[PDB]
Ligand binder design. Sequence first.
Ligand SMILES: O=P(O)(O)OC[C@H]1O[C@](O)(CO)[C@@H](O)[C@@H]1O
Ligand SMILES: [Zn+2]
Length: 391
Amino acid sequence: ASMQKLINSVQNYAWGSKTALTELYGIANPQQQPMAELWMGAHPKSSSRITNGETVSLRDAIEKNKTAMLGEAVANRFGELPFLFKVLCAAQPLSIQVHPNKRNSEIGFAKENAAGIPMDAAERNYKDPNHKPELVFALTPFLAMNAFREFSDIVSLLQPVAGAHSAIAHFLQVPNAERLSQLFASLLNMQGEEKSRALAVLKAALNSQQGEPWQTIRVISEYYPDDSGLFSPLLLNVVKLNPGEAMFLFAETPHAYLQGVALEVMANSDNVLRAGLTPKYIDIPELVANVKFEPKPAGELLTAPVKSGAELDFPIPVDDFAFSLHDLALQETSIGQHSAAILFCVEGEAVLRKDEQRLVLKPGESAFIGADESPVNASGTGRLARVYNKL
Ligand SMILES: O=P(O)(O)OC[C@H]1O[C@](O)(CO)[C@@H](O)[C@@H]1O
Ligand SMILES: [Zn+2]
């Protein structure tokens, strides 16, 4: 068939919401498992499936017909579906992460390869010799951290906890990148009574400070009461995304998803260094070597989308994938691209038409459109999200 309704994987990671996908989309969860990620794509560990037919892996379907399904551009640039499209349901706060830049990704990938670390081992931090974009788009109000605050904001936030650690006093004395770097490494490396003393100072502050980011620290502390990452909302921008707002997650930049439901667009294979809010051991020298200690003003956090007719594009400084929202009307509009696409119903209801074939998508449902089947006409109400390739 021209248009293929997707059967998608739900990853039941423990931090997932037992209700979100069900409440929002009516996805069945009789056993009340936590449902953390809904995957739409062709990841080798869990490809989406299509039916027509028997059920086949989308990955297997693409592999047998790359140019026809991916399009020439993608078949030749990437040799596979270059994006993975997720619904994320964060019921608990997740780890602080840093994605290394292109150069350092090549090195760490090679280091781990030379060490003979299986690509799907838990020890594996680098799974791609490249850096690629990651886009998060809020479906419900979405709490997160992203990037270092302006130095003067950090100074103001650290004052109430100046006595927690000498590294904090050190930074306040000269609030610059070097000392911010030293502060970040010192906090992460706190041990024993040094650590517990610092956390005691922070906890006392939680009792005499109001509003954000103190409230976020309190929320996080319920899950990570003994984590040096509790200091992080004082260093990093805490953001509350309204539904329909999005952020691009740059290289070398600490970020964390704390609560809510979001769409995420990424590559299949990524590199992750942890920077707190984790029971895993962190290699601090490596983390610090891969972080860029420069402030990012809050006014620059959201990606500014571009509206053209019924289409709202979210421009991405990368060839690997593109992301747009399409407002549906009862009169058909053409949705076309020179690549494979995944269309996901955000809300309302979508009817997709290709000549004689019609395909209905209720919210939470998605379809794969092969490059050779573009365009399709969409009508209905609400909004359709599309991941594809602009090349
Ligand atoms: O899967 P993506 O696109 O890489 O997103 C996750 C992140 O991990 C990285 O691969 C690490 O370099 C980044 O490219 C990316 O920002
Ligand atoms: Zn990330």
